[PDB]
Amino acid sequence: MAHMIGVYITKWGFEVETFKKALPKNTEVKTIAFTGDWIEAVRQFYSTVKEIDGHIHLALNGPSSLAFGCGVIFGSLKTFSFWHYQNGAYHTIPITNVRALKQRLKQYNYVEPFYEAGGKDLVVMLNYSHHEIKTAVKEYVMNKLRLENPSYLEISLKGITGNIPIELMPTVANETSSLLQDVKKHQSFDRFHFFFSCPVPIAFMVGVAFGLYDELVVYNFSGTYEPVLSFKDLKEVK
Amino acid sequence: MIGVYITKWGFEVETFKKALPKNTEVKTIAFTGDWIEAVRQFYSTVKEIDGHIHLALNGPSSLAFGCGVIFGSLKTFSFWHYQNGAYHTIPITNVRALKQRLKQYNYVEPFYEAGGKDLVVMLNYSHHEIKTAVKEYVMNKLRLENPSYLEISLKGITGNIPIELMPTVANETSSLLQDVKKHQSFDRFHFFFSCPVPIAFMVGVAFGLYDELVVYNFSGTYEPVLSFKDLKEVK
């Protein structure tokens, strides 16, 4: 009865065959159309994975902010393979168990946190990819969020910024997850504000690990930053 | 596989075809002094190709940069550079290697002059300063308000860049173009070139269409030839 299925979240739709051909023979693929409505796509994603019995093959052709949202409501009852499009075709992320991602670490090999102590709003920046975002996020926060002296957590990577292989993505996601729990020891935050310069698979896996435990807001860059998912919306998806 | 040849002429395509693997078709894109039209036709040609692309370009580095910007960074490519009377392949089988952000730079160095939120970028591998001429143009024709300036130039290397170092120089340049954003959040980048075509292409690939950018070309004087709005509308 239980049988593997593909779920493809895409800003387009026409290109789904590339994903399908990468999967085992006779794997059905359910397409979720992302049209610039984050909460609707997350809702449809939840609806789809809720009723799936079996291993889920995921791919997401779309923003990392959406990937993070989908991760947050994914939960920990289902297994998945994450497929990523690179230098030719789709390749599976080394199959990462959900419980494995939430493992807390004492030693980090890749992530480098820079914590700036402030108030109860924490601005989280995953500064992992080619495009440098720190000053852009701070300018946006200062001009648009109307917060008093927010705390900042900028996370950069040692060595691999802008060139993260598939094979390191589970490790980077695990390390990020562990840091996001560590930071809560500094103080009790009211709210986490998430900004990404980050591969989609990592964003998804970090969302899976972090979950919907804290008040959070997810932000997307499209010429400027805007909030695209809130804790309230994500809670109401279930 | 196919080859795409972007050229200010057209008649000379056969040496490119001959350099490629047997039975590679080549599409010529004829540049006639309209940058946005050539970039449009380039994008139209490569848009639905996923596999490896062979590229060559006979024309200005400013065009090469524009083609790089709309190429994206999902597709692998070989750039065939014409040097010392023949074509030489620059194979890029991992595009992310061009986008790796660096702490250690071996071949290029930044010279940053702090100003406002317009950044004037000079990609100058010539071993003779272009800053005075660019500044005169900026002050007199663009009338920008207290722009920041970033010159990127060679260090250590005293002459031409060998083929073998062109990916490295492009990678380092691209990394510096992101590193400068640590100084402040810029609103707009203005690109001026004195540089080899393959480097311009590779830097365009990495930089992408992520910041408001304007591309300038030197032909006796400087003029803008590509804007962010035009490039956005190509897609």
Residue numbers in the entry:
A (entry chain B): -2 to 235
B (entry chain A): 1 to 235
Reproduce, without paraphrasing, sentences from the article in which this PDB structure was first reported.
Here, we show that thermophilic viruses have appropriated the SAVED domain of CalpL as an anti-CRISPR, AcrIII-2 (second anti-CRISPR of type III systems), which they use to degrade cA4. AcrIII-2 dimers sandwich cA4, degrading it in a shared active site to short linear products, using a mechanism highly reminiscent of CalpL. Here, we demonstrate that the viral protein binds and degrades cyclic tetra-adenylate (cA4), generating linear products, similar to the ring nuclease activity of the CalpL protein.
The structure of AcrIII-2, solved by molecular replacement with X-ray crystallography with data to 1.79 Å resolution, revealed two molecules in the asymmetric unit. Each molecule resembles a canonical SAVED subunit, which sits in a head-to-tail configuration. The structure of an AcrIII-2 monomer comprises two CARF-like domains tethered by a 19-residue loop. Each CARF domain contains a five-stranded β-sheet sandwiched between three α-helices; strands 1 to 4 of the β-sheet lie parallel, whilst the fifth strand is anti-parallel. The loop fusing the domains is followed by a six-residue β-strand that lies anti-parallel to the first β-strand of the canonical C-terminal CARF domain, in essence making this a six-stranded β-sheet. The crystal structure of AcrIII-2 revealed a dimeric composition in the absence of cA4, with SAVED subunits orientated similarly to that observed in the cryoEM structure of the CalpL filament bound to cA4. Coupled with the observation of a dimeric species formed by cross-linking in the absence of cA4, these data suggest that apo AcrIII-2 dimerises, and it is likely the dimers and longer filaments are stabilised upon cA4 binding. It does, however, demonstrate that the global orientation of the two AcrIII-2 SAVED domains is not significantly different from the SAVED domains of CcaCalpL, meaning AcrIII-2 was highly likely to bind cA4 at the dimer interface.
